A paper describes a structure:
In SARS-CoV-2, S is a transmembrane glycoprotein that forms homotrimers on the viral membrane and that is cleaved during virus maturation into two subunits, S1 and S2, that remain associated in the viral membrane-bound S trimer. The receptor binding domain (RBD), located within S1, mediates the binding to the primary host receptor, the human angiotensin converting enzyme 2 (hACE2), while membrane fusion and viral entry are driven by the S2 domain. Prior structural work at near-atomic resolution has shown S to be homotrimeric and to adopt distinct confirmations that can influence its ability to bind hACE2. Specifically, the RBD domains in the S trimer can adopt an “up” conformation or be buried inside S (“down” conformation).
We obtained the cryo-EM structure of the SARS-CoV-2 S protein bound to compound 2, used as a prototype of present series of compounds with antiviral cell-entry inhibition. We used an S protein harboring the D614G mutation present in all major SARS-CoV-2 strains except the ancestral Wuhan-Hu-1 strain. From a dataset of 3500 movies, two main conformational populations were isolated by 3D EM data classification, without applying any internal symmetry restriction (see the Experimental Section for details). The most abundant conformation (74% of the particles; 3.4 Å resolution) had one RBD in up position and two in down position per S protein trimer. Detailed inspection did not reveal remarkable conformational differences nor additional nonprotein densities that could be attributable to the binding of compound 2.
Author numbering:
A (entry chain C): 386 to 434
B (entry chain C): 533 to 621, 641 to 676, 689 to 730
C (entry chain C): 44 to 70, 76 to 336
D (entry chain A): 731 to 827, 854 to 1072
E (entry chain C): 927 to 1121
F (entry chain B): 731 to 779
G (entry chain B): 975 to 1023
């Protein structure tokens, strides 16, 4: 439904990490990277690729 | 853009359903939307059009079916609370609502079935449901004079029944 | 249930629905039984006096590649076959009046080529058939309803004794279900079989030798509706009142009674539905 | 109180079909709330009939209008003015002052019609005394009726006839003051106004509930439907639906409790109409203050206003 | 009176209108109770309504979440029935309380109040039991026929006004008499009649 | 009867700030309850009078 | 059953699921009490009158 819906304040973020690290970049998670480098909001509403 | 016809409209990711009509309110250049007292969307500005249009929901209200009685007849008349009678798909327009299936008459009788707003419909005899303004009772004026008095010359004892549920 | 009124929402024949008559009677050179699209639940009513009508074929495309169902009627037993059958354009059931023995035998049972595999096979309870070719009005009326839901196939039928007029009768009788099938398969179209009444007067070939006689059947679709059903003491359904056939009908459904006392009742609140859909977006053509 | 109707389905699930199917699992909740309001709607119409329609026939006042020195012109209907309402009635009306699936059904009895019932009872009382409540009205001259009413409260007849000029002036003067008093402040019509405000606030509160998230991603039902998956909607919509039913349930429950108070008030009104407007009530303080000579009923928006004539002893 | 009683007996048998109020109470209670039983069948947010079916069908960790919805919904349904019931009880109590007043005011003693008991003046009342109700037969007196008569407030016989005592003056024209308001009897004026 | 007023915030969410924010999502339920209760408390004064 | 205890023991992403149930339950208790009081108040009012 992304094509149909419309939005404001679009933000694009790119970073590269190991596959073990893939799990960490998600809402409400605890990881070394996630809790010390980059942490997504609890109410975050965006796709993670 | 379609105006004054009910339509499904998606304006800048906002979805609702109502007749769209041009509105006089002065949107200060800065504001895109609009809202009412109860915080419901009332007006929007088309991005391309850049005009302000009022939004109101198309119709509402239950349809009430008036029946004389199954034993008496198999035909009924329907009253719609909301319809102005141009909106709905023998039509009589009343304050209570839009009524179909009944031919109203000037003469007034007691209200057998109440359609609301002072109009009542009852079966009459060849046979069709009729809606009319109710008359409360026969209008009779008692004579009043400085020297006139009325005293009963006979009396009748009558028994009347009152029913109440105690428990 | 006994002596109670129950409102059930499931596929049913809408009261007073459009009925499409299909004719296979020669009366001249008239014979038709073409393919018909089948929606969710297709109602079939058959009126047959000489049992010319005998079978139903159901399939997605009848390609012998997608599973299809065939019901063939035999005097000994109703035959239900599930199988990837390869049907011809023009299937039928053949019967001949032999002078040496006055009986009606099958002439060409080439309805199908073969069966690659069979998901399911079945034989219906035993019953018997008249097998008479004599001309006349349809002395009996037979109705079957076919619907498929949740991977099951359901057939409900009842038989009407009074021939009366050619068209379906005004009197209303409920129908019990003969069978249900475990086999679950998709269905997009259907067809009905005929008994060719082949005789000595006919040319004597599969393309031009045939004189069938009278046949008649009507096919009607089913849509979801709310139906109020009255159940008597014994438990058969004596009469049914439709929820949305007219203003009076809706009132009965709401009060759950066949007879509605004089008064005003409110049902089925109406909201106008939008004629067209409009999407308005910004003129920007930039690709982000 | 003004009839209020809420289609349960419209408010809770909205226009969208998905909201309806989810609501269907709940079963009777949607219907009972809709049904409960209808009972209150019908009951409100019933209250007016009981309170106002206590007369079989509509009486009419005599053209000559000789009432032994009592000026009833203000309470009685004026032909020139529209809606056949008395000056006192007009003042009262002036003082007092579908959005989203909520529809206000109009009253069965119109304001003009109610004004007429009140006029009829009032017309009957002046001409026929208390006799009209019991059977067909029998005309008695007002002085005699007044004299007879005095006898009920324990003052002899001679007092009324001898003091008729004085008694009449006080009655005319008393009527002037009530009219003057009503125009000056809204305090007199406070009880009627309170009913309207309480009902209005409940309705308004209900509308505000729709905005509340109730733990959903977003308040608007369409936004959730538009921006979420079909499987994803089992969870988000459900919180919204549960909350909305509770909001509806609170409103319906509150309305019934409010309705009962009004129902109780209507019964009191029926007794007052029966006991005071027709007949004389010996009960102390039921009608007015002091010994109660008579009562007149004037229609008000969604209410009955009673003018009571009472006898109070001035000097000792 | 004897004839009047006959009509009421005849009236009750012919139509259910007289007993409509009592009938209404029973239907509502029956309906409310019936709805509550019907609610058990509805599943608020679960695979199935039957608790046993849910238990067999789904796992123990998972089952708790599903059962909670059924419990929550049923509990709300029960609460609605109770809340609705209390309000209904209130209506009956008020109605029940009125009957007690009527019984005391009307059956036990004559009541002066107009329309508390019946229509017109109320001589007496009788109480009859009904299923879950009390039915009152009210005997009331209503004047039927009246004749217009000329009247005067007081009679000035010897320069001193004479006012009727417990009566209202009426006259044919030829002669003047004093009579009671409710029924008409004529008595020649005397010292006893007026003061 | 004894007039009782209950603060919806204090009884439900409690002292905790997190409970206050979650309560806010529900709407005017906390407020509506207070209105009903005071009105009952106000009514009790009127009765004695 | 204690807000202080749930708040300390669990972190905000997952605290809210537990805190929500308590809030919903308590709200129900309050409404029942408030509804009960009104019925009781109505009875008292009739008695008062
Ligand atoms: C008072 O009314 C009663 C009741 O209507 C009258 O009694 C009837 O009189 C007629 C004519 O004499 C009789 O045929 C009936 O049998 C009587 N009973 C009824 C019930 O009608 C009575 O005549 C009237 N007038 C009086 C007493 O002056
Ligand atoms: C319920 O069904 C039975 C049949 O199963 C009905 O009973 C019939 O009663 C009459 C009495 O003479 C006779 O026909 C038989 O004793 C019974 N039936 C038959 C078919 O012979 C009974 O009346 C039914 N109840 C209904 C229709 O309400
Ligand atoms: C006292 C007497 O004998 N007769 C009076 C008369 O004096 C008076 O003028 C009249 C009223 O006009 O009523 C009579
Ligand atoms: C609705 O009825 C009113 C009657 O006063 C009329 O003025 C109005 O034009 C009608 N609405 C339409 C045609 O949309
Ligand atoms: C009653 O009417 C007559 C009409 O002739 C009049 O003379 C008399 O003054 C009136 N009575 C009053 C005002 O008491
Ligand atoms: C009665 O009141 C009206 C309105 O104030 C006035 O016109 C009239 O003169 C008053 N008095 C009499 C005796 O008519
Ligand atoms: C009584 O009053 C008026 C005259 O004042 C007259 O029209 C009517 O016919 C009379 N009725 C009776 C029953 O005497
Ligand atoms: C008035 O009453 C007397 C009663 O004795 C009677 O003689 C007289 O005829 C009556 N007057 C009439 C009918 O005018």
């Amino acid at each position: 439904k992304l094509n149909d819906l419309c939005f404001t304040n679009v933000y694009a973020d790119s970073f590269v990490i190991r596959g073990d690290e893939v799990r960490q970049i998600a809402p409400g998670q605890t990881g070394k990277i996630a809790d010390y480098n980059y942490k997504l909001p609890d109410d975050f509403t965006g796709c993670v690729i | 853009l379609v105006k004054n016809k009910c339509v499904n409209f998606n304006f800048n990711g906002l979805t609702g359903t109502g007749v769209l009509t041009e509105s006089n309110k002065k949107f200060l250049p800065f504001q895109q939307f609009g809202r009412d007292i109860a915080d419901t969307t009332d007006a929007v500005r088309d991005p391309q059009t850049l005009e302000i249009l009022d939004i109101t929901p198309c119709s509402f209200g239950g349809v009430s079916v008036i029946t004389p009685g199954t034993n008496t007849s198999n035909q009924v008349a329907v009253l719609y609370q909301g319809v102005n009678c141009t909106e709905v798909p023998n039509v009589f327009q009343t304050r209570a609502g839009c009524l179909i299936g009944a031919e109203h008459v000037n003469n007034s009788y007691e209200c057998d079935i109440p359609i609301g707003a002072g109009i009542c419909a009852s079966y009459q005899t060849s046979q069709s449901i009729i809606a009319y303004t109710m008359s409360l009772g026969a209008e009779n004026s008692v004579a009043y004079s400085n020297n006139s008095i009325a005293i009963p010359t006979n009396f009748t004892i009558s028994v009347t029944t009152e029913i109440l549920p105690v428990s | 249930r006994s002596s109670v009124l129950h409102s059930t929402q499931d596929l049913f024949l809408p009261f007073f629905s459009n009925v499409t008559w299909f004719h296979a009677i020669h009366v001249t050179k008239r014979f038709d039984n073409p393919v018909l699209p089948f929606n969710d639940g297709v109602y079939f009513a058959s009126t047959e006096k000489s049992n010319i009508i005998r079978g139903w074929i159901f399939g997605t495309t009848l390609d012998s590649k997608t599973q299809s169902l065939l019901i063939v009627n035999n005097a000994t037993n109703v035959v239900i076959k599930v199988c990837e059958f390869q049907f011809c354009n023009d299937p039928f059931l053949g019967v001949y009046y032999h002078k040496n023995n006055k009986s009606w035998m099958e002439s060409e049972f080439r309805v199908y080529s073969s069966a690659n595999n069979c998901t399911f096979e079945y034989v219906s309870q035993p019953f018997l058939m008249d097998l008479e070719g004599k001309q006349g009005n349809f002395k009996n009326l037979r109705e079957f309803v076919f619907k498929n839901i949740d991977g099951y196939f359901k057939i409900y039928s009842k038989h009407t004794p009074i021939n009366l007029v050619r068209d379906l009768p005004q009197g209303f009788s409920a129908l019990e279900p003969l069978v249900d099938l475990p086999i679950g398969i998709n269905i997009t179209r259907f067809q009905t079989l005929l008994a060719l009444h082949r005789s000595y007067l006919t040319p004597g070939d599969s393309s031009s030798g045939w004189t069938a006689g009278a046949a008649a059947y009507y096919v009607g679709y089913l849509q979801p509706r709310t139906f109020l059903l009255k159940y008597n003491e014994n438990g058969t359904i004596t009469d049914a009142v439709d929820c949305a056939l007219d203003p009076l009908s809706e009132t009965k459904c709401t009060l759950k009674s066949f007879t509605v006392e004089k008064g005003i009742y409110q049902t089925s609140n109406f909201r106008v539905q939008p004629t067209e859909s409009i999407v308005r977006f910004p003129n920007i053509t930039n690709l982000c | 109180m003004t009839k209020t109707s809420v289609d349960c389905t419209m408010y809770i699930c909205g226009d969208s079909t998905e909201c309806s199917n989810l609501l269907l699992q709940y079963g009777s909740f949607c219907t009972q709330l809709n049904r409960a309001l209808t009972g209150i709607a019908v009951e409100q119409d019933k209250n007016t009939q009981e309170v106002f329609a206590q007369v079989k026939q509509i009486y009419k006042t005599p053209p000559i209008k000789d009432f032994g020195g009592f000026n009833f012109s203000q309470i009685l209907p004026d032909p020139s003015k529209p809606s056949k309402r008395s000056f006192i009635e007009d003042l009262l009306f002036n003082k007092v002052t579908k959005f989203n699936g909520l529809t206000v059904l109009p009253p069965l009895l119109t304001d003009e019609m109610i004004a007429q019932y009140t006029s009829a009872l009032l017309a009957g009382t002046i001409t026929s005394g208390w006799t009209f409540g019991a059977g067909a009205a029998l005309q008695i001259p007002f002085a005699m009726q007044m004299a007879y009413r005095f006898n009920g409260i324990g003052v002899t007849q001679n007092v009324l006839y001898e003091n008729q000029k004085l008694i009449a002036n006080q009655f005319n003067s008393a009527i002037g003051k009530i009219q003057d008093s009503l125009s000056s402040t809204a305090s007199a019509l406070g009880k009627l106004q309170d009913v309207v405000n309480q009902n209005a606030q409940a309705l308004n509160t209900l509308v505000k509930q729709l905005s509340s998230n109730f733990g959903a991603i977003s308040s608007v039902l369409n936004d959730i439907l538009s921006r979420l998956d079909p499987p994803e909607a089992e969870v988000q919509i459900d919180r919204l639906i549960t909350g909305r039913l509770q909001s509806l349930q609170t409103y319906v429950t509150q309305q019934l409790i409010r309705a009962a108070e009004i129902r109780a008030s209507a019964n009191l009104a029926a007794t007052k109409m029966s006991e005071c407007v027709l007949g004389q009530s010996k009960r102390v303080d039921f009608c007015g203050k002091g010994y109660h000579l008579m009562s007149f009923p004037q229609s008000a928006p969604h209410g009955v206003v009673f003018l009571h004539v009472t006898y109070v002893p001035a000097q000792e | 009176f004897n004839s009047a009683i006959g009509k009421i007996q005849d009236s009750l048998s012919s139509t259910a209108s007289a007993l409509g109020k009592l009938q209404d109470v029973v239907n509502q209670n029956a309906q409310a109770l019936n709805t509550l039983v019907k609610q058990l069948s509805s599943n608020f947010g679960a695979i199935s309504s039957v608790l046993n079916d849910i238990l067999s069908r789904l796992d123990p960790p998972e089952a708790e979440v599903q059962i909670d919805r059924l419990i929550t919904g049923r509990l709300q349904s029960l609460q609605t029935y109770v809340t609705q019931q209390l309000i209904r009880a209130a209506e009956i109590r008020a109605s029940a309380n009125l009957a007690a007043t009527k019984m005391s005011e009307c059956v036990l003693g004559q009541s002066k109040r107009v329309d508390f008991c019946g229509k017109g003046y109320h001589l007496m009342s009788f109480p009859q039991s009904a299923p879950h109700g009390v039915v009152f037969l009210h005997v009331t007196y209503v004047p039927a026929q009246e004749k217009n008569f000329t009247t005067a407030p007081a009679i000035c016989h010897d320069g001193k006004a004479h006012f009727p005592r417990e009566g209202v003056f009426v006259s044919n024209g030829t002669h003047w008499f004093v009579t009671q308001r409710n029924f008409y009897e004529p008595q020649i004026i005397t010292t006893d009649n007026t003061f």
